[PDB]
Amino acid sequence: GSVVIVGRIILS
Amino acid sequence: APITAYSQQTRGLLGCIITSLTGRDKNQVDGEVQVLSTATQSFLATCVNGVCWTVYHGAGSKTLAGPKGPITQMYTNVDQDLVGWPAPPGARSMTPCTCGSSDLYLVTRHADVIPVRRRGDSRGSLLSPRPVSYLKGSSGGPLLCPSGHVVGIFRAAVCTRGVAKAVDFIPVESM
Numbered sequence A: 001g002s003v004v005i006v007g008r009i010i011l012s
Numbered sequence B: 001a002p003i004t005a006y007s008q009q010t011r012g013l014l015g016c017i018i019t020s021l022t023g024r025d026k027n028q029v030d031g032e033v034q035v036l037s038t039a040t041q042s043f044l045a046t047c048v049n050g051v052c053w054t055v056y057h058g059a060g061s062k063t064l065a066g067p068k069g070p071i072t073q074m075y076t077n078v079d080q081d082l083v084g085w086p087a088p089p090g091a092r093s094m095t096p097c098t099c100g101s102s103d104l105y106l107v108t109r110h111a112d113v114i115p116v117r118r119r120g121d122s123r124g125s126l127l128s129p130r131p132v133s134y135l136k137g138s139s140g141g142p143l144l145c146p147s148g149h150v151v152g153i154f155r156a157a158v159c160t161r162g163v164a165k166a167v168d169f170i171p172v173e174s175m
């Protein structure tokens, strides 16, 4: 199984 | 906290199970920090110098699903608990800190930004204690200096009776 990107944090 | 953060979900359970099995992710990638999942766990990756870094105890030796199929790890170090994949294009790459600030900020999976006091090369105390459940799923997320540069990546909570008083992190030097 691959690791999956299920979301993301946007930095500012 | 000076730094601010928000999250955007990009997939749900079904796409995730299928993307793990194909290893092919067509989603557009954005952000400094990727929220990651495998079959059994949930963790984060911080983008630094065009590499996505995370914890080995979460990713093990697995590929990362990418727009051209699975991405092989560029860096695997079991003893530092650190792995890195070439960042998919779209990821916003951060820059290592250096300045030696000891006012630090942990970004969690829920996009909260929490104040940490640096205590040693790979340790920090939380200025207010938090349940450890609140930190679960944030391994791999960034410890930032006041300027938004990365000093490290969160590894483990120091805790008792389910409350976390401090954090273990992998220093950006190891990267």
Ligand SMILES: *[C@@](=O)([C]([C][C](F)F)[N]C(=O)[C]([C][C]([C])[C])[N]C(=O)[C]([C][C]C([O])=O)[N]C(=O)OC([C])([C])[C])C([O])=O
Residues within 6 Å of the ligand: B042, B043, B044, B055, B057, B058, B132, B135, B136, B137, B138, B139, B140, B155, B156, B157, B158, B159, B168
């Ligand atoms: C990360 O995987 C966190 C999760 C969050 F912090 F709990 N990391 C871990 O859960 C690590 C995993 C080991 C293999 C490093 N363990 C810890 O955080 C434990 C806490 C377990 C518990 O609450 O009793 N801390 C720990 O082992 O600390 C020392 C100081 C002994 C290294 C997340 O889940 O995303």
